[PDB]
Amino acid sequence: QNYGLNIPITGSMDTVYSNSTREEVFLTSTLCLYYPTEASTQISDGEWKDSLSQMFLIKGWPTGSVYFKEYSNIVDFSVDPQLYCDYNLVLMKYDQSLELDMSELADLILNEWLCNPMDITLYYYQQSGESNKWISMGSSCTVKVCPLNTQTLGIGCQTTNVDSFETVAENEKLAIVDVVDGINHKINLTTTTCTIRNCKKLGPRENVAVIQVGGANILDITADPTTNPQIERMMRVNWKRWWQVFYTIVDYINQIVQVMSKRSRSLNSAAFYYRV
Amino acid sequence: VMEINTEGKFFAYKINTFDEVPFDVNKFAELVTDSPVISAIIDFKTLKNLNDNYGITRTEALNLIKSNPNMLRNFINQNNPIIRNRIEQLILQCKL
Amino acid sequence: MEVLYSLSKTLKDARDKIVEGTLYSNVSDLIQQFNQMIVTMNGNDFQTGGIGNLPIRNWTFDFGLLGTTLLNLDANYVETARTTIEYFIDFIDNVCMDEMVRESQRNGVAPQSEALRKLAGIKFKRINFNNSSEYIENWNLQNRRQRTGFVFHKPNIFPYSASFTLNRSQPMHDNLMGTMWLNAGSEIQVAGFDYSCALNAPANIQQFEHIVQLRRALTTATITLLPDAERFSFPRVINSADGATTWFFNPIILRPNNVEVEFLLNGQIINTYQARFGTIVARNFDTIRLSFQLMRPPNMTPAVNALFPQAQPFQHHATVGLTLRIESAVCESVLADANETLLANVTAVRQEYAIPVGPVFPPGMNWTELITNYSPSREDNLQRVFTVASIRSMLIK
């Protein structure tokens, strides 16, 4: 075991590839559904988690492997969403004016962000390149960024005057702020309430899928405006009844799990790179 | 001798008798990294024309090749029209 | 075996030159050779076959000498000649079949097939006629320690090998980079691919190398080098190296740049060709290093810019390839060709009579497994069986 080394591997093309693995990824892994509370409110039941578990058992997943999680709504779930769970689905209802919040959450939970803390009070923070953002999470994240000249003097804003700063997020629960990569900035953000992390984007998180339960293709995980990729795991399904939505998920759970994959950073094989 | 113009044109030619030979790139590219390059104030074309019209000797041919001024002055003293024409060509090419 | 070749040559000349109407001046020397062969073989006895289904056959020679008084060959002559020639052709065919089915770990070049061992004796030295064909000439020039050479057109020097090396990979197999290659026959066909199109490589230039170690040295090889390896130039899905999953390959072919083809012998660069396609020449070489590069296009049309994004998805994967065809070459140890029938003839006569799988040759004479490890015992046995195959093919087609 040669952890922490890029070692090339040679593979032939005459080799007969092996048998299926769905039975393994069901008998071992743990499916994990995150739904909004309005779902259960419309269902109006409470044996229904057990009923869904039994149907998943009919479909293959053992009894204890399928686990359910609730959340009040997308904006509240946005603050520190940690899916400590093996195969994640996030049902995400779509409503007008929450397009950007939905996109931010989709980016955050679909792409593996590795990140470091930020002392707003002390340093001036600069963004390296295309894959670096600052994510601010809290109850009221009012980030006020003031850019700095090469002499460390403000433009459009006075370092001693918080008012003239340029706001780029008001009272957001989650905010992926992207600034002009190449300039020092002085931030102010309400340190008692909202934490901020200088984060950058590793490869994708291939363990979490997002089922947009509502409308059109509005998710934009890539902050770049030129590219609007349609990832395999940003699924979208129409809805008029949460029972029908859940039945669709249960019926096609094989396909959703095929779309997803085991988390790379959770593997033992990633031990000495960024294993998590 | 392997000679190059700054505008692509290239030649290769013996010293004793200026009969040009097929150029050898990937030999010139290797040589020029290390060897002592020589400016070509007497271009290969004018040099060949001079040799054909006048018939310089081996020593004068080598000195013209190496742009030795001690000997290049001798032709301009002689009023050699080929070298004259070339040198006024450069002086008139020094416009702007 | 030289005596066996002499028998084959003199019977071939008997079948060709002795025809109805010929001057005897045309066939005087041949008739003298034929009569010498008849006298030497007369009174002897041979046993042939007895391995596999090849039946045991007894040969006893007692034949009348061909006449020599005739000025001009008539139909009476060729009838007697034909009667003797048919028997001799059958005998040589069976001896060659026996010798090219037999096999031996130790002392391969020595003759097996006790009929041929008898023919190697002292009585049958007088039948040595001439040794002009390429295979017997190499046999003699190698029996006496002198350099030998076989000219080959499309020599299948590479064992069949289709595979790939991944210098960067993930379980999702979404951002790969490495090389793929098929080496088969006289074809090397290698394609280096990069999913990010050298986005983060130093100076936006990915570097690819491919070694190919010939099992035996080649000489005066005429080679055909082209870009854009056509095999690895269409979409695929490929089973993973482990064999668990399968990954998607969707090539878009960039041009390979500053390609260097280095032909090596004992680790010393014998020849180097930088960005010189078309036909090329390798004077003598034992290994091939093909180095090429995937340089990101600095300037880009909007379409190609859309092809190559800065993000993760990478719906298209850049690729640059080379193809190298050994059109012809010269080698010491015997090989198989697209122009000679000796490998096929030996394999056919082995398959005919169900010869059991022997010590040195692989089962069924799989040439890939024979060439992948090419021990000196295998080389000796292969030269022996190929020489007998040519000797037999000189008469039996």
Added chain:
Amino acid sequence: MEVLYSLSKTLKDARDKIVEGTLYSNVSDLIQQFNQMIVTMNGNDFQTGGIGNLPIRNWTFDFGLLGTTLLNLDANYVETARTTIEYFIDFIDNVCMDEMVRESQRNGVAPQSEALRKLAGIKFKRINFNNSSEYIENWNLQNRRQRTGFVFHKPNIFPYSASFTLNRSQPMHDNLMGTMWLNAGSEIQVAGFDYSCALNAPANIQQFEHIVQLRRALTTATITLLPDAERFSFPRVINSADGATTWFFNPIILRPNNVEVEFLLNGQIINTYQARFGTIVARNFDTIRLSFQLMRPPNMTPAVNALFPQAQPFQHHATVGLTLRIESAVCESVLADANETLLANVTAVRQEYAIPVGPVFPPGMNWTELITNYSPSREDNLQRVFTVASIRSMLIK
């Protein structure tokens, strides 16, 4: 040259025919030839080499004759003949190398290599044995003006060139039309591509033409014509003509309709084939005119209809291909081949001893330049050097 080939022929025949046990009837004529060679070359001094790194070797001949009173050859005869034959073989090899390494701007056909120039004298006219080989026979048939011919397998006549022309284009490179083509050795592969799939062309057909002029007439050539040029039938990114920006290519391979191939000699149409693929023949042709057409298919299934819109994008580009391999031919002047090894021999001998780039041949004897520019002087020198290479290859491999 004729004397040199005769020396090589008699030495090869002495190495083959003169073996132990052979009847004297089989070697009488060759022994007389060998004796005359010994007598005429006795007391003569040659000096080969002296250019590049080829060592300067002095040759002096003092050799005894060969017997005639034997009936069957034995070890003594063979041993003496072997000692003499090795010396002559080395001498001939060095003479051939000396003649191969040299060139001459004027008077190419006449000999170089003062050793061979001495051989050309009246004193050595008695050595000529028989000029059987194809190269020497053509040497004679051209030395006295008659109709020669060399038969070639895959004659690499076309100089390497992969390129394209654009009959409609614009800096965004979204709507192109034109042809791509790769000529390499014996194979042409031409693909006419239209990005609009002939939307506005007359009758929805776009005409493509590709004229390739050979540098030598090829007589009685068998050709394999097929559709769907392989190398231009997959996505690429290609430079601009000026090299500024790269443009995407994304072919969908329509078939070529009413395809004509015209084989032309001196402008006149010699042969013409009309939508007839497979094996074809060309009596003579100095040039080939491949004409074909991309016809928009009138009846489009919904899928292909989606592929080909009337709007601007044109996300997929229609193409129609042709591939054409000269499987064999006959030419009045020498060329490299996939079967022969003459070019390989010559280039290898030059590279071994680092002969400086000479007057006529390009550096490294690169066939692409050597066939792109094929002046009569270059042709004459190539024929001389190839004949010498064949003479060498008779004995040395």
Added chain:
Amino acid sequence: NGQIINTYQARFGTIVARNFDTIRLSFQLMRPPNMTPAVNALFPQAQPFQHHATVGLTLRIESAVCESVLADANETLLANVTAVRQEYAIPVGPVFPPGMNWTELITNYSPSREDNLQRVFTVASIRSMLIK
């Protein structure tokens, strides 16, 4: 063949090309630095351009020596052959163009055509020794 055999710069009148296969003429149009007002009126700075400046060169090959045969303005070999063909209405042959048209006979002058031309020219000289 890319071999600069001769170069004559700023020379007119008779010259000698010892041996050659291509002629590479080069010249230049230099705008007059000074101008009489007539010439100034000829050449304006504006667009109309009533008068168009030109430079020229004539190059006549007086005599030459060619390895192969060629028609010439001295002997009547080509005329003799073409006359013999036209007088008797010989159909078109394989190699020669129709009518022995010299222009397309020399644009494409392959070795077969060249040797046939040599044969007919030698025969025509032989004939002209007797019949004129």
Added chain:
Amino acid sequence: MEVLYSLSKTLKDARDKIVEGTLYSNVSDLIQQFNQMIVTMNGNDFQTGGIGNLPIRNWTFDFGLLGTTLLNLDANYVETARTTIEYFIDFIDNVCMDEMVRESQRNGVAPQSEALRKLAGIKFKRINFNNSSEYIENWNLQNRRQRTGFVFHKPNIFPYSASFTLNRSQPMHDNLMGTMWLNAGSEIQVAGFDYSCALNAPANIQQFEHIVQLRRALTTATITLLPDAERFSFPRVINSADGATTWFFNPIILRPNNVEVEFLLNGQIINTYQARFGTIVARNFDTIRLSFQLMRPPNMTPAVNALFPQAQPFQHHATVGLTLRIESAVCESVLADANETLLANVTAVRQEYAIPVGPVFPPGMNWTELITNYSPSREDNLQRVFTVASIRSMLIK
């Protein structure tokens, strides 16, 4: 070359046997041989040298025959013997040096050194005396193959290679497991190490395997096998595989259990030994497979228990090793030894005169590279120069 050896043998026997007071009955045959040598070499001219700093020299022979009318040799006879033999010895020395300093990629067996080439004529076979030495005898046998073999004492068949592989590793190199080895000369020393003492191995047994691929088969070899590889039984710090960092190594030497050593030829096992130490034999082997194991000791005294914890730190790293000396063997091809100075003589002759590096041998006769790449051309040239040095050593030391 047989003639050259015969010269050296007759000169050595003349210098030895022709001494004062010796009976003529002791030296009659030797005097006859010497007189044949004199008559054969008389009236000739040789030239030797002209490469590197080895200067040109010219040898001319006009010597009188030794007397024969003497019953018992006296002093005045041996002085004439001196005046002849010293000159002859000098001539032989320079011929041998000239032959050693030359090379040829092709047909290396045939003599270089035009002096020796002249000696290889027909007038000089009468000097052939007797070919008794091992090298000349094997030269004859190889040049007309019977099975041959040079007996070597402690032959340096391996190339100098010390290296290591890690089957388990971390970037901080806290917990390693793998093998280290040094193959040098006739010594293989291989030590497999585990930093956890096979704590988590299956059944607390860790399996180590090492493969050594001889460049040429060895026959009737004697191998001394012992445990405890010496070179890897003290603390070290080793540069990493990438070379970025260095990792500490702190052996604690456990014994190797169920050690197996398999000697294979062409892939099949020829000999196999298990837990056998001391001297052993290898019949005919081309590869060595040394398998051994690191078994965690079940019962552990307090001290060893303190040594081996179950936590990561692992201040002490368990290792088990083997040492293997090929004391003597028989090789069909030639190799350097520790008992024979042939390689030393060849290298010294090349070095003293600063010969330009030729096509075949590596720079400075670097034996490690030479045995690493030991192609047949290189082998033939090596055998030629070694037998020439063997001839030279009979007279010059």
